[PDB]
Design a protein around this ligand. Structure first.
Ligand SMILES: Nc1ncnc2c1ncn2[C@@H]1O[C@H](CSCC[C@H](N)C(=O)O)[C@@H](O)[C@H]1O
Ligand SMILES: [Zn+2]
Lengths: 138, 474
């Protein structure tokens, strides 16, 4: 659905956010490309507690669910684009994979729940903003 | 059954104990290994065996799969001397061409396990609920043991043995002594033994196990086989509704071998089937390969049962952290926290260039940082910008910090290299000169790869240390 719905909050890539999310913003982080806004309905997903390095993500440019293995949530360079200057982003998981700009908002899951959301990509590597420590979403 | 129950209880009681620490780690392993063999020795081996040659059942797998809409065109089953069985092309296949798919109804999955004869026990036991791979392994055994089950044509083509560590001789394991990989081997063996002992008791006593096909015979060999069959073959697919993800064994996919490349596999939810496309052009007669994933050599040997030589993704583990005894601990901790970096963690030194990740570099830049430098990175709005250049190799804090950083790393990598029992020339000599078993070869090749990575790390750190010092002088 391009976003993660847990409890009464919706998590989105900050640069995909709309005015409605800003009005209902409870938390944001520039450095993680995340925006959290409230919802009126209860959600369905769960933020996984697990210390996994493996999972599946919906790659919308392929319309397929790919398994990936990922490096932990370190500090990674992100290339300059129409939303951000070249910068490093924190808490970003990395894996070899397929990612085009239209894949932003695709969700990464393991058998324990949601792990993160597609925030960066290109040239064979796909990177996810880790959401595992936003404990307060529950 | 009395002998098995008496020893089973002993095993569970011994293997449930916490580790004794490194001085006795080898000792713990051989004690469990001895006890496990005492138990295995009294059992008949696999409960269900088949009389034909493994390859004699391929025609039934192919027939069965074709009846259910799977792809059975353009390739066939052959025995490769080097790897063992796998697919060979019969018609030329082009890269990115879809050549293989498997419909969901043929998959063995946890979701389907829930509805099998195992269902009533799955729903009650905590481990079966918590461990996807265990529930899948027990589902596999239940189906193996059921003569009219749907998956007999697939189960009948699985090998009777695997080359993962659970099948290693004691003297083959011995070659890994003091390597990092052995820590993961010891754990794997120990946990497998514990799971068997626990479940054996559950099947014998729990009332929902009364109708299971595993009620009459569950040998160590059966469990070991099932676990190995899952861990060497499993993949992850979305659940039927796309709401979660789950483990699966995929017939007629797990016959592909491993090579280097991109991931060519994935699940097509819209058509409810697993798909795979060609990684590279294959002419008829060529072996078909897929990329298993960006795994390390230790993982390939321990979980997949093989040592891949040109592993461009290999690495070794290094543990680092900021001492709590430091004077600047709190300040360093704050800088790292702002950067999203933990005070202590396990990092890795990589085979390929560059040897270190940005996170480790940033970590170390703080690790060696002094008080004044920390204040620059903490006080003032510009501090945040300084913090987010820490992982940028073109932005050294000071010539002094780079020299201290590379000096530190040069020494840590050398110290780790000094803990190995043998050196590089000696291992190369052994591999070339001895007519070693395959399992012994893996243990040695893995041991050697860890040393080669560390040696490279030392040399590179030494060079950077000299480079930055020279810049300091100008
Ligand atoms: N390039 C490679 N080099 C060495 N072993 C490989 C390999 N690719 C795959 N394997 C082998 O294939 C197994 C994965 S399943 C592939 C089919 C397998 N030969 C069979 O008999 O059913 C591994 O356990 C390993 O034994
Ligand atoms: Zn998980």
């Amino acid at each position: 659905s391009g976003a993660v719905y847990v409890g009464n909050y919706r998590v989105v890539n900050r640069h995909l956010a709309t005015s409605a999310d800003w009005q209902n913003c409870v938390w944001e982080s520039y450095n993680r490309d995340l925006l959290v806004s409230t919802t009126t309905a209860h959600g369905c997903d769960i933020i996984a507690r697990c210390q996994c390095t493996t999972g599946v993500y919906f790659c919308a440019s392929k319309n397929k669910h790919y398994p990936i293995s990922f490096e932990g949530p370190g500090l990674v360079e992100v290339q300059e684009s129409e939303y951000y200057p070249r910068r490093y982003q924190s808490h970003v998981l990395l894996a070899a994979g397929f990612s085009e700009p239209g894949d932003a908002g695709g969700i990464l899951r393991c058998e324990h729940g949601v792990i993160g959301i597609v925030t960066m990509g290109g040239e064979g590597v796909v990177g996810f903003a880790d959401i595992r420590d936003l404990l307060w979403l529950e | 059954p009395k002998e098995i129950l008496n020893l089973t209880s002993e095993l569970l009681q011994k293997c449930s104990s916490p580790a004794p620490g490194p001085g006795k780690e080898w000792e713990e392993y051989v004690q469990i290994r001895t006890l496990v063999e005492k138990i295995r020795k009294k059992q008949k081996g696999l409960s269900v065996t088949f009389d034909g040659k493994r390859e004699d059942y391929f025609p039934d797998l192919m027939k069965w799969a074709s009846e259910n809409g799977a792809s059975v065109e353009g390739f066939e089953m052959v025995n490769f001397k080097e790897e063992g069985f796998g697919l060979r092309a019969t018609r030329d296949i082009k890269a990115e061409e879809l050549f293989l798919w498997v419909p969901r109804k043929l998959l063995m999955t946890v979701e389907s396990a829930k509805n099998s004869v195992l269902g009533p026990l799955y729903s009650q036991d905590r481990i079966l609920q918590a461990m996807g791979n265990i529930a899948l392994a027990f589902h596999l055994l239940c189906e193996r043991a059921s003569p009219n089950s749907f998956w007999q044509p697939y189960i009948q083509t699985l090998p009777s043995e695997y080359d993962t560590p659970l099948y290693f001789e004691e003297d083959e394991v011995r070659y890994l002594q003091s390597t990092q990989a052995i820590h993961d081997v010891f754990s794997q063996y120990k946990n497998t033994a514990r799971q068997y002992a626990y479940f054996y008791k559950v099947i014998q006593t729990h009332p929902h196990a009364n109708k299971l096909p595993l009620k009459d015979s569950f040998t160590y060999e059966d469990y070991r086989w099932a676990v190995s069959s899952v861990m060497t073959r499993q993949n992850q697919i979305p659940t039927e509704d796309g709401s979660r993800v789950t483990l699966a064994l995929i017939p007629l996919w797990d016959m592909c071998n491993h090579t280097n490349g991109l991931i060519t596999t994935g699940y097509n939810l819209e058509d409810d089937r697993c798909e795979c496309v060609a990684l590279q052009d294959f002419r008829a007669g060529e072996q078909i390969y897929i990329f298993y994933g960006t795994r390390s050599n230790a993982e390939f040997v321990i979980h997949s049962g093989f040592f891949f030589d040109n592993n461009s993704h290999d690495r070794v583990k290094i543990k680092l952290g900021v001492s709590k005894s430091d004077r600047l601990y709190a300040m360093k901790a704050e800088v790292l926290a702002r950067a999203g970096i933990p005070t202590s963690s396990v990092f890795a030194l990589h085979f390929t260039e560059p040897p270190i990740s940005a996170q480790l570099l940033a970590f170390l830049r703080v690790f060696c940082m002094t008080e004044e430098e920390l204040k620059e990175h903490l006080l003032g709005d510009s501090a945040i910008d300084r913090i987010f250049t820490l992982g940028n190799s073109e932005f050294p804090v000071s010539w002094d910090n780079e020299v201290k950083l590379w000096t530190f790393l040069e020494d840590r990598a050398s110290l780790l290299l000094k803990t190995y029992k043998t050196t590089i020339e000696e291992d190369k000599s052994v591999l070339k000169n001895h007519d070693l078993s395959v399992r012994a070869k893996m243990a040695i090749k893995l041991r050697l790869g860890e040393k080669e990575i560390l040696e490279k790390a030392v040399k590179s750190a030494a060079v950077n240390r000299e480079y930055y010092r020279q810049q300091m002088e100008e």
